[PDB]
Design a protein around this ligand. Structure first.
Ligand SMILES: CC(C)=CCC/C(C)=C/CC/C(C)=C/CC/C(C)=C(\F)COP(=O)(O)OP(=O)(O)O
Ligand SMILES: [Mg+2]
Ligand SMILES: [Mg+2]
Ligand SMILES: [Mg+2]
Length: 750
């Protein structure tokens, strides 16, 4: 069954957490081959392998065709690098004679395929042509004459003279291809780029290379220690204790299964944070040079979990043009590191220039990548497209999880200088759990919808089907199974409010409206007679619901909360009549005056107080105002709701007779301003409001219940996603109607 498989999945993924160390990463033929060339000189002048095991590994790990690398994952450049080097390793100690000839065949055959646009992995035209230089010297028989290989070697020899013309020698940004530049490297100065673990850029190949040219001890102890840990081979990079912890947590959170691993996540992040610094961070704790991807993931993930971290760390990757690079040790920019840069900028607090600068670079780079570089039908295209099309402040949790489940690759191989695997980060158990769990929870949601559609039918509110209740439901955002009573009360209150609003700005007369809110202020049915039949029915459905919800509230909260609960309702209806009082007077308020009334009339208060009081967390009398109205985070969300709503609905409301709006009031305050000027200013206000709410949300708090705070905060999402795709002609390009099937109706093939 599903629940059983998910439970055993949770168990195993918890093991994975508890086992986290320096990193799970695959051996590297290329890197281990280099380690194997290292020579010790016996007293009898005869040279033998310094690291017997590393040669033994290359000996026993020839694939089939017969190259070295990753069987299930073939790649031209990767196979060429791995096999050639492996061949050179065997040849040097003249052994593995069969694999040599066997692999020499694989190379010769495939060399005639490097032509010519089959994109080359980073620094291929430097580390490979160097492998072929040593191939000649050993007499290995290969087609060195191909017009293409002669071009790669040409560019390399041209790149060598550049280092000769460097008073400071090899630039820091070519350190990646260290071992493809031996003949122009100053071996004293190069050492200035050694990490505290003896390694160069965490690369075993590079570290072997400097070991061979210098006999440096630290280089040796890094390699020796690594081989002993990997049982006689080496990965393409190590350690990766920082990257692995961050990606694991991010991937799980992103897959929608973060709630099952709260304690294990806290342990992983605590570890990372102890190694956090204003300088940025690299793959592992011992990196000399930080990298953008790990730092960007660190920023976002750490901030997301309540850690105090500064966006200034990003500037360590920014140049004069405001452009970012992946790492001072290389020339190429990694697409992934730019995705993570953008995603980190999603969590910007107000006045964080670095976040602004990151997003101004990353976004166009990302859209550029989508247009030219990435193939459409791919998981990756689908992943990056969601990142830019539904950024954080409009990313609905379930929709975000459903979409990432489809783009998460559990059979992925990363490409640095060669291909490697990180089993914790590309993990089939994570993916399976994510799907099983999504289904499990989806069934719960179906049942809630059923209950909700039933209510809409029986309540007589028939006089907008489930399709209108489903959109409110969808908008609840807070999806965890424990919060069912909260989501249901929210949806009912929300559905009623859409009704109350149509009543307040369309159907009711000022008098009918006033009478209604008097009925609310009295909290009884004494004034039912003063209002038409249709509004009598609304009031009664509403009032009946209040009794039912309020009884449930006593159960969760442990005592009467009626006095707290009446306040948001009164404030909300009083603001409604105030809207109408202005309209009757023909008065257009100032932008500020306008917000005072409309920032409340938008209705964040009533749809949140009763529901948060049902989540389970105790809300003390003096805390109500700290988490609900008028706390800052609450105001800010209310503001984003109001203003964003204005931009997409002011045109249709003005044709219906309404006057006041964010657009009209701004234009009245600012002579000469057009509607376009108003919208532009408004969106800047909304943008800043979202960022300040994040700052308020993540701020340390002693007495504000986190669940309750989270439910308010994640209500900002629904408004942003709803109106984002209305194209200013009024045409809704994307509609909530379409996410409903994906999130609530279609299960995930298991
Ligand atoms: C946006 C909708 C309808 C659903 C998604 C968001 C959601 C579930 C909100 C639930 C809370 C509710 C009902 C709030 C009140 C309902 C609101 C302000 C609307 F329906 C917005 O439409 P409007 O432009 O006519 O509003 P207004 O300018 O007249 O004030
Ligand atoms: Mg309206
Ligand atoms: Mg209204
Ligand atoms: Mg409106």
């Amino acid at each position: 069954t599903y629940q059983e498989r998910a439970d055993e999945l949770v168990v195993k993924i918890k093991d994975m957490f508890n086992a986290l160390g320096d990193g799970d990463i695959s051996p590297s033929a290329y890197d281990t081959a280099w380690v194997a060339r290292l020579a010790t000189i016996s007293s009898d002048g005869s040279e033998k392998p310094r690291f017997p095991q590393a040669l033994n590994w290359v000996f026993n790990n020839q694939l089939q065709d017969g190259s070295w690398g990753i069987e299930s994952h073939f790649s031209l450049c990767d196979r060429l690098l791995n096999t050639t080097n492996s061949v050179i390793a065997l040849s040097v100690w003249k052994t593995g004679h069969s694999q040599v000839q066997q692999g020499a065949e694989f190379i010769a055959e495939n060399l005639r395929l490097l032509n010519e646009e089959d994109e080359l992995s980073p620094d291929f035209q430097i580390i490979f042509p160097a492998l072929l230089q040593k191939a000649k010297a050993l007499g290995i028989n290969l087609p060195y004459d191909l017009p293409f290989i002669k071009y790669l070697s040409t560019t390399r020899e041209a790149r060598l003279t550049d280092v000769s013309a460097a008073a400071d020698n090899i630039p820091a940004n070519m350190l990646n291809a260290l071992e493809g530049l031996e003949e122009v490297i100053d071996w004293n100065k190069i050492m200035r780029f050694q990490s505290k673990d003896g390694s160069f850029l965490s690369s075993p190949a590079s570290t072997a290379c400097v070991l061979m040219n210098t006999g440096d001890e630290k280089c040796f102890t890094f390699l020796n220690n690594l081989l002993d840990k990997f049982g006689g081979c080496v990965p393409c990079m190590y350690s990766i204790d920082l990257l692995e912890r961050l990606s694991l947590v991010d991937n799980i959170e992103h897959l929608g299964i973060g709630r099952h691993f709260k304690q294990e996540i806290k342990g992983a992040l605590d570890y990372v944070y102890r190694h956090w610094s204003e300088r940025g961070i690299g793959w592992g704790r011992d990196s000399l040079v930080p990298d953008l991807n790990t730092t960007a993931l660190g920023l976002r993930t750490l901030r997301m979990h309540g850690y105090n971290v500064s966006s200034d760390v990003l500037n360590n990757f920014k140049d004069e043009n405001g452009r970012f690079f992946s790492s001072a040790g290389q020339t190429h920019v990694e697409l992934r590191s730019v995705v993570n840069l953008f995603r980190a900028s999603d969590l910007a607090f107000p006045d964080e220039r670095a976040m602004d600068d990151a997003r101004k670079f990353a976004e166009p780079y990302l859209r550029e990548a989508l247009a030219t570089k990435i193939s459409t039908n791919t998981k990756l295209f689908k992943e990056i497209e969601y990142v830019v099309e539904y950024p954080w402040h409009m990313s609905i949790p379930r929709l975000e999880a459903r979409s990432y489940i489809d783009s998460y690759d559990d059979n992925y191989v990363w490409q640095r200088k060669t291909l490697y695997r990180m089993p914790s980060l590309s993990n089939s158990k994570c993916l399976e759990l994510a799907k099983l769990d999504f289904n499990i929870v989806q069934s719960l949601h179906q049942e809630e919808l059923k209950l909700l559609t039933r209510w809409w039918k029986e309540s007589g509110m028939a006089d907008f089907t489930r399709h209108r209740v489903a959109e409110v439901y969808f908008s609840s955002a807070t999806f965890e199974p424990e919060y069912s009573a909260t989501r249901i009360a929210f949806t009912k209150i929300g559905c009623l409010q859409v009704l109350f609003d149509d009543m307040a700005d369309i159907f009711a007369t000022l008098d009918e409206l006033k009478s209604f809110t008097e009925g609310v202020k009295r909290w009884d049915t004494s004034l039912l007679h003063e209002i038409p039949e249709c509004m009598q029915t609304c009031f009664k459905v509403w009032f009946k619901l209040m009794e039912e919800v309020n009884n449930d509230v006593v159960k969760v909260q442990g005592r009467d909360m009626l006095a707290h609960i009446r306040k948001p309702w009164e404030l909300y209806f009083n603001c409604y009549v105030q809207e109408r009082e202005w309209l009757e007077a023909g008065y257009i308020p100032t932008f500020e005056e306008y917000l005072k009334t409309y920032a409340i009339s938008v209705g964040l208060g009533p749809c949140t107080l009763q529901p948060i009081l049902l989540m389970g967390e105790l809300v003390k009398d003096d805390v109500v105002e700290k988490v609900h109205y008028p706390s800052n985070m609450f105001e800010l969300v209310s503001l984003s709701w109001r203003l964003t709503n204005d931009t997409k609905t002011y045109q249709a409301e003005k044709a219906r007779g309404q006057q006041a709006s964010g657009i009209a009031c701004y234009m009245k305050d600012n002579p000469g301003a057009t509607e376009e000027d108003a919208i532009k200013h408004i969106c800047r206000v909304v943008d800043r409001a979202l960022k300040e709410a994040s700052f308020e949300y993540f701020k340390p708090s002693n007495d504000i219940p986190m669940g309750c705070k989270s439910f308010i905060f994640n209500l900002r999402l629904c408004v942003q996603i709803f109106y984002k795709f209305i194209d200013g002609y009024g045409i809704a390009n994307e509609e909530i109607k379409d996410y409903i099937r994906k999130v609530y109706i279609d299960p995930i093939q298991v």
